[PDB]
Design a protein around this ligand. Structure first.
Ligand SMILES: *Cc1cc2c(cc1C)nc1c(=O)[nH]c(=O)nc-1n2C[C@H](O)[C@H](O)[C@H](O)COP(=O)(O)OP(=O)(O)OC[C@H]1O[C@@H](n2cnc3c(N)ncnc32)[C@H](O)[C@@H]1O
Ligand SMILES: *Cc1cc2c(cc1C)nc1c(=O)[nH]c(=O)nc-1n2C[C@H](O)[C@H](O)[C@H](O)COP(=O)(O)OP(=O)(O)OC[C@H]1O[C@@H](n2cnc3c(N)ncnc32)[C@H](O)[C@@H]1O
Lengths: 577, 577, 52, 104
């Protein structure tokens, strides 16, 4: 590889790929490094659930997720095992064992927080929900002019939506989807609006949805190539980026220090522009390892010279979950238009409807599907077709219900008792709360303990803030209980519950954006440029300084697009040599 | 896609790749089809645990295994859920729900049996244990001549071991490995021999082992290419192979019918030679779907015209498992050569040994690793280095202990309480029993129920035979209990247990080999040619007609080599034109 | 059940099991304090936990 | 069939039952506190040998019931505690509290 590029990007997630798409397409010589490896097939960084096998065995996909989520900070284990044989060796203390972090207070953790080190990052497994933030959740891009701010965000979001292939039409003809959507529309008539969850996905067939990923944004193929003979891009997997080298004046980055994990070689890579898109945790780690912020346990009797807000004001959403089993009323309603003659399994069994009849509660397309299912499978007790797609329903965040909602199905590990319930009956409920940014909520890095890549060990100091965040979180639980009851009762084993803190993986504000470093307690400006530094940019959810309930990736992507606009105005591509 | 090849191979697992390696190398124009897709990175069909991330987070790999093991036959679920809300819909029967197979007697199943549909098949996730069979477990290749039979096996197994890169040296300087190996060697001195498990793997560094796979055997890259300009090979993923067409005479296969899963189109592909290497279950399924054997519930009153032994005499191994926590005596013995002065953590702490001392129990390389760990990590209570590789110990099958043994570590999901025990103390015990072939033990296929690819649904009728099989299985359990106690007591949560039937994934005899179709109740001859058919060969564990405890893949590969020798002597490659 | 109902544990060490799925509105201590009749004198690793 | 095998434990001075001077129990009496490990040596070896013996002997009658696999029970669950106020001939020589008449 060259030592010299126009642009170096750390991380090949969807945010890294947004930079790569914009900057490769504008004629810059780009190198992208990822600590992880290529493993999504021939489409590099593509979504792992787009195999025929996973489209046919959806729930096995939960194993793929779990197998690439590595816990950020695990406290020292203090569980007593006192049924060992007297001959087995035992320590007399709960010593530092099994990669546990002794810095971590088990009672101020984000235990569910995890990271993914693969090409394409978490976009190789994500759920693909890409709602816009409303003003209340949304960082400001233009101060003191709400229309100009709105217009800029619409522009940026529309482009981000095009990059991700966001749509709200991919489940429109699902019986289960419409059964739920219609019931909730009616129950909340004049109070709340429901729609399809906006999803980064393209339907290919009645039983195949091609979910979007990093690969959708940028195909990650080295360039030049036949499709792009004038473009310049190299991806380097299995390279750990360890630090950016600051000049003495703290005005410029001078190089990127990398460790090739295959060869073991270390290099200094040189570029005009350095972009860190390693995720909310690992962007922060890289910066602290580079001398930004402060290494070790926070010391307010000793704040840092550089980026003193780095790794403070961290936010993570509250998440509540249950599953429901569809009501008898709703199930019976699916076949409301049918005239049912005979008894099932006999020659005299008839299931019929009058197309177009004005007393019909359902459209013809619905009734035809139900009729055909009922006539072709007379042993089956349910009127819902076997291949009917899942529900994908939301009522988006509003001031009177300040949480995002997903009323849907994703990959799930059902227990053997739960497998006793026909999957057509089951609906997942996920409500997401917004968390107030507070200075005392921190991600910091040990000056003694290291992680598996020999980098300073991440440590959380986090609690959900008292006041509005907590009140809202409990209100949100209640809301899920109230709403879900309109659809069916809870599925035993998936009763209403808060998820382990950080399991939701929507961490924000670790390297947060604002107008003024001091006044807005922030690390990057609205171009995502690190304050003081001409040529260092951060991308990702870590830039988001607001309290948000909606899924953050689309918003992070929108910010990266704006960042790229600045970069294009301020840095000249090298002549193609 | 051409319409004609010299050879068509169904399946890209290690056995398919053995035929590809042999026959592509011999100059044949070869096509290979797999129902699954490329998803191991740039090295097509390679081992998924060869990522730096999985070498650093080894236990997360159980998720990869689970994510690609799809259950063969799941009986109807009869578990009662009686805590639904009264409003939730419920059927009044345990109806056919959630992909269950209503043909399947839950009491005569191999419930742990599963299949993997990905390029490279199960060799993308396997444990890589490749022992040879001794005579007692081994099918005959030469009748009435023991020394000729021995010579032929040695030749074949030696070539197979080169293809897989089998070795017994990759763990030779592990402390844990030698600690266990030495203790068991001493305990069974004069009674049994211990060695390293033969493993298809190449050590690349102290902390990285490159596990073998189908990619090791054959790299699966289309040819001709720069490295093999005169070879011809094409791989076609996402193609469901559905049947081989028999001529009227049942003497020749005339084409392979395929279903392209991406386009949805069906085609007939022509070849001179047709090789089925789709695994023990799916080879049998493709054959039954093609008019061999009998569709539906087996019926002695109406025996099949072709291959009446197909899907009878099936074998699966008994498997017993536990984990142990290393004894205090063994742990203390690790540092038996050290002189320890002072108090850990302080100035004067000193751990020293005398290199070459005739009174040393351990070699200098061992003592040096122990000394450095103890001096560099004075807070750690154990003498075993943090990066010390796992044990990989076996006493191979013998008449006096007719089971295979693995005393080792592989990827495992530890509970929170088990996570309390330092990983360096833990050893896995897996003992594998041999199962007598019995006519009444069957894999058959429904004439009404279909699987996820619309093929006849596999159904088991299996019990571990009475007599020797069952007595040995219980003796094997006791043997594990006795031998394991020499190393340490059982780990709570991983107490000695029989595993679910077929979880072991060593199914054989489904399309079994023998000399005479009728006399030996078999389906293929010793060249793996289907009786009566000039040009149809089967490869895999399904060929193995014996009762074996050792892991069968190396043996199945050895049979495939011998098959390829036949093909090379009886079929002429097309001119490279 | 009769047996279990009249066996009262002799010495229960302080419980250090993390419950982190409480609602944010629920009261939580910042430490594993002496709770529910536990014995802060008891080393959990040198106990007869089953003694009753 | 249930299998229960009971090991013997060497009396060791370091294995103690003591009482808190600060914590009290539900009857306001000094709180009992254990300081106990199974002694190294014979006690531990025999305990593990006992485990194996149970595994070998039980196999003659049948295989293990799933959910009741061979296991050590939590220390003291057996409820056969002894030696807390132990007998001997001579208080000092036999390290004891009562004589053979059970007299303090
Ligand atoms: C896991 C998950 C995530 C998820 C979700 C459901 C699951 C189970 N559902 C989502 C939803 O429906 N909508 C939403 O908006 N997001 C959802 N997510 C989260 C989403 O995947 C992430 O927000 C998004 O992927 C973040 O993108 P970003 O590009 O910022 O970060 P990343 O994907 O984590 O990629 C970071 C990469 O950089 C690498 N890396 C890390 N450290 C280094 C170093 N030191 N050097 C070089 N590279 C590094 C990684 O390996 C990685 O690929
Ligand atoms: C899963 C596993 C396997 C395993 C192991 C541990 C686990 C968790 N440990 C083993 C060990 O230590 N030693 C050993 O000998 N075996 C071990 N195994 C088993 C081993 O993986 C298998 O025995 C081996 O892979 C068998 O090879 P074979 O090439 O015969 O079959 P395969 O790997 O299953 O691949 C078959 C393929 O064919 C495809 N397929 C199936 N049906 C079709 C149709 N209709 N059309 C086209 N292709 C088809 C598959 O998708 C597959 O890739």
């Amino acid at each position: 590889m060259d030592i010299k590029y126009d642009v170096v990007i750390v991380g090949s997630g969807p945010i890294g790929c947004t930079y790569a798409r914009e900057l490769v397409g504008a004629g810059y010589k780009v190198a992208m490094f990822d600590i992880g490896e290529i493993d999504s097939g021939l489409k590099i960084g593509a979504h792992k659930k787009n195999t025929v096998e996973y489209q046919k065995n959806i729930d096995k996909f939960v194993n793929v997720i779990q197998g690439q989520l590595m816990s950020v900070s695990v406290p020292v284990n203090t569980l007593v095992v006192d049924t060992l044989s007297p001959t087995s060796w035992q320590a007399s203390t709960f010593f530092v064992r099994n990669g546990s972090n002794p810095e971590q207070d088990p009672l101020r953790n984000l235990s569910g927080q995890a990271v993914t080190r693969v090409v394409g990052g978490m976009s190789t497994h994500w759920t693909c929900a890409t709602p816009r933030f409303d003003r209340e959740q949304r960082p400001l891009l233009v101060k003191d002019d709400a229309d100009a701010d709105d217009a800029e965000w619409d522009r940026l979001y529309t482009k981000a939506e095009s990059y991700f292939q966001t749509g709200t039409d991919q489940f429109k003809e699902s019986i289960r989807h419409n059964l739920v959507l219609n019931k909730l529309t009616e129950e909340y008539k004049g109070q709340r609006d429901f729609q399809q969850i906006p999803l980064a996905a393209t339907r290919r067939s009645p039983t195949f949805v091609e979910w979007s990923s990093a690969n959708t944004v940028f195909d990650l193929q080295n360039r030049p190539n036949t499709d792009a003979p004038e473009e310049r891009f190299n991806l380097f997997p299995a390279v750990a980026c360890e630090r950016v080298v600051r000049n003495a004046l703290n005005s410029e980055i001078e190089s990127l220090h990398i460790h090739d994990l295959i060869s073991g070689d270390r290099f200094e890579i040189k570029a005009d522009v350095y972009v860190l898109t390693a995720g909310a945790v690992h962007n922060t780690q890289l910066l602290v390892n580079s001398g930004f912020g402060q290494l070790g346990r926070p010391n307010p009797a000793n704040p840092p010279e550089l980026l003193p807000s780095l790794g403070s004001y961290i936010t993570e959403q509250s998440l509540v979950f249950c599953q429901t089993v569809m009501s008898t009323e709703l199930i019976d309603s699916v076949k409301s238009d049918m005239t049912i003659r005979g008894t099932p399994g006999e020659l005299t069994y008839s299931v019929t409807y009058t197309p177009g009849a004005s007393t019909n509660k359902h459209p013809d397309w619905w009734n035809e599907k139900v009729k055909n299912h009922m006539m072709q499978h007379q042993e089956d007790p349910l009127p819902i077709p076997f291949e009917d797609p899942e529900p994908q329903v939301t009522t988006l965040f509003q001031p009177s219900h300040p949480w995002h909602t997903q009323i849907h199905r994703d990959a799930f590990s059902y227990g053997a008792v739960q497998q006793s319930i026909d999957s057509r009956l089951i609906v997942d409920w996920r409500f997401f709360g917004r968390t107030e940014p507070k200075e005392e909520n921190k991600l910091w890095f040990s000056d003694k303990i290291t992680d598996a890549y020999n980098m300073p060990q991440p440590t959380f100091d986090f609690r959900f803030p008292a006041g509005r965040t907590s009140k809202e979180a409990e209100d949100m639980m209640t809301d899920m209980c109230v709403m879900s009851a309109k659809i069916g009762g809870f599925l035993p084993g998936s009763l209403p519950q808060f998820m382990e803190p950080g399991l939701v993986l929507n961490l924000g504000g670790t390297h947060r954006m604002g107008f003024d470093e001091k006044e807005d307690n922030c690390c990057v400006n609205t171009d995502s440029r690190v304050f003081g530094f001409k040529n260092l940019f951060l991308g990702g959810c870590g830039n988001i300084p607001t309290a948000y309930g909606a899924n953050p990736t689309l918003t992070a992507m929108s910010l990266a697009i704006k960042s790229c606009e600045y970069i294009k105005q301020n840095f000249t591509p090298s002549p193609f040599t």
